[PDB]
Design an enzyme around this catalytic site. Structure first.
Site, PDB file in Angstrom:
ATOM      1  N   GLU A  11       0.780  -1.193   0.000  1.00  0.00           N
ATOM      2  CA  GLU A  11       0.000   0.000   0.000  1.00  0.00           C
ATOM      3  C   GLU A  11       0.841   1.286   0.000  1.00  0.00           C
ATOM      4  O   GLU A  11       0.358   2.323  -0.432  1.00  0.00           O
ATOM      5  CB  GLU A  11      -0.958   0.055   1.227  1.00  0.00           C
ATOM      6  CG  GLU A  11      -1.967  -1.102   1.287  1.00  0.00           C
ATOM      7  CD  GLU A  11      -3.065  -1.104   0.226  1.00  0.00           C
ATOM      8  OE1 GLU A  11      -3.220   0.008  -0.446  1.00  0.00           O
ATOM      9  OE2 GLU A  11      -3.790  -2.054   0.051  1.00  0.00           O
ATOM     10  N   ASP A  20      -6.846   6.245  -4.996  1.00  0.00           N
ATOM     11  CA  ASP A  20      -6.311   4.915  -5.202  1.00  0.00           C
ATOM     12  C   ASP A  20      -6.373   4.436  -6.685  1.00  0.00           C
ATOM     13  O   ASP A  20      -6.764   5.196  -7.575  1.00  0.00           O
ATOM     14  CB  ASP A  20      -6.908   3.972  -4.147  1.00  0.00           C
ATOM     15  CG  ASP A  20      -8.324   3.530  -4.486  1.00  0.00           C
ATOM     16  OD1 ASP A  20      -8.844   4.064  -5.545  1.00  0.00           O
ATOM     17  OD2 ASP A  20      -8.914   2.715  -3.837  1.00  0.00           O
ATOM     18  N   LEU A  32      -8.970   3.721   2.912  1.00  0.00           N
ATOM     19  CA  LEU A  32      -9.993   4.327   2.047  1.00  0.00           C
ATOM     20  C   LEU A  32     -10.925   5.294   2.765  1.00  0.00           C
ATOM     21  O   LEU A  32     -11.543   5.015   3.801  1.00  0.00           O
ATOM     22  CB  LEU A  32     -10.878   3.295   1.373  1.00  0.00           C
ATOM     23  CG  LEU A  32     -12.081   3.952   0.666  1.00  0.00           C
ATOM     24  CD1 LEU A  32     -11.698   4.394  -0.742  1.00  0.00           C
ATOM     25  CD2 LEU A  32     -13.265   2.993   0.568  1.00  0.00           C
ATOM     26  N   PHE A 104      -8.251  -6.859   3.414  1.00  0.00           N
ATOM     27  CA  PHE A 104      -7.889  -5.468   3.596  1.00  0.00           C
ATOM     28  C   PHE A 104      -8.074  -4.742   2.262  1.00  0.00           C
ATOM     29  O   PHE A 104      -8.543  -3.643   2.191  1.00  0.00           O
ATOM     30  CB  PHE A 104      -6.361  -5.388   3.882  1.00  0.00           C
ATOM     31  CG  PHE A 104      -5.879  -3.993   4.201  1.00  0.00           C
ATOM     32  CD1 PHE A 104      -5.422  -3.129   3.198  1.00  0.00           C
ATOM     33  CD2 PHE A 104      -5.785  -3.567   5.528  1.00  0.00           C
ATOM     34  CE1 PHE A 104      -4.960  -1.849   3.529  1.00  0.00           C
ATOM     35  CE2 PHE A 104      -5.304  -2.307   5.877  1.00  0.00           C
ATOM     36  CZ  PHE A 104      -4.879  -1.447   4.866  1.00  0.00           C
ATOM     37  N   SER A 117     -11.489 -20.788  -4.791  1.00  0.00           N
ATOM     38  CA  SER A 117     -10.102 -20.752  -4.262  1.00  0.00           C
ATOM     39  C   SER A 117     -10.112 -21.018  -2.808  1.00  0.00           C
ATOM     40  O   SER A 117      -9.172 -21.569  -2.273  1.00  0.00           O
ATOM     41  CB  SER A 117      -9.446 -19.421  -4.379  1.00  0.00           C
ATOM     42  OG  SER A 117      -9.369 -19.108  -5.734  1.00  0.00           O
TER      43      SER A 117
HETATM   44 XE   LIG Z   1      -9.274 -16.472  -1.342  1.00  0.00          XE
END
Ligand SMILES: [Xe]
Ligand SMILES: [Cl-]
Ligand SMILES: [Cl-]
Ligand SMILES: [Xe]
EC number: 3.2.1.17
Length: 162
Positions: A11, A20, A32, A104, A117
């Protein structure tokens, strides 16, 4: 290496309001502030988050403070999410860090939708997960950062950040 360092890498650090990757008003270590196009609005949001009239600038510590709260909320969000928790608890320490980074970055909800996943990670099918993680908008919009995170998730080491 740890989550803090990892995310500080990905970041960066900025003391003035910036925009961003998605064009949004952000400050500090990827904190943010708002999805709205209004700089005043971002300013309002900043002053309320910090407790003072910042004028759009904050100190380093102030930035570190928000960061601390953002990391804390990220873990906690993981832990409170029914789809996330089981995966996380199943992982080793380095891999957890990967999941936190992503959360995050894209929020819980968003990560919570990587069903496939999530399952592969939970089965310890590293390579498959990795290929799957890469079929995403996430990956196509910020591939360098995505590649680091995926490598971490895949290998369980910090090689991508050394
Ligand atoms: Xe993931
Ligand atoms: Cl806040
Ligand atoms: Cl990139
Ligand atoms: Xe991950």
């Amino acid at each position: 290496m740890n989550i803090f360092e990892m995310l500080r890498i990905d970041e960066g650090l900025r003391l003035k309001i910036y925009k961003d990757t998605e064009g949004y008003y952000t400050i500090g270590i990827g904190h943010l502030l708002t999805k709205s196009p209004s700089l005043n609005a971002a300013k309002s949001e900043l002053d309320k988050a910090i407790g003072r009239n910042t004028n759009g600038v904050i100190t380093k510590d102030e930035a570190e403070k928000l960061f601390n709260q953002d990391v804390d909320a990220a873990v906690r969000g993981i832990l409170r999410n029914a789809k996330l928790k089981p995966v996380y608890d199943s992982l080793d320490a380095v891999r957890r860090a990967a999941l936190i980074n992503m959360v995050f970055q894209m929020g819980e909800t968003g990560v919570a939708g990587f069903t496939n996943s999530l399952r592969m990670l939970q089965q310890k099918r590293w390579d498959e997960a990795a290929v799957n993680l890469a079929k995403s908008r996430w990956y196509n919009q910020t591939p360098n950062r995505a590649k680091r995170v995926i490598t971490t998730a895949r290998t369980g080491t910090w090689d991508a950040y050394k």
